[PDB]
Amino acid sequence: LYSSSDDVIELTPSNFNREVIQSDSLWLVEFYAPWCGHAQRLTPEWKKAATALKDVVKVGAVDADKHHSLGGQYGVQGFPTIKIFGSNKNRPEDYQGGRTGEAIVDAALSALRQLVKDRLG
């Protein structure tokens, strides 16, 4: 679904803690499986969000079929599941908003406003 030609960061269990957990950035992470129609539908919008958010918010994706352990670690019971990783990287909240590029970016900016205002206080 994704490749080096896009701004979506491929997240394996072999870089997750490093790229995401030990990161001061806001992170959006999609947990998917490539055979899942709802996940395929989301792919273009996810890329659009990642590109729009370049250098502002980190946007990742995990094949939680190929890596079910990581999928299990975050209680992923379906695809696509989108998690938002804010100030506290151990309470990532679930996104249940629209799946358009704009909806994702709107949610991304809201979460970002919160991370920054947390920094301030």
Partner: peptide, 6 residues
């Protein structure tokens, strides 16, 4: 809106 995991 979602495919169940296995």
């Amino acid at each position: 809106e979602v495919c169940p995991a296995g």
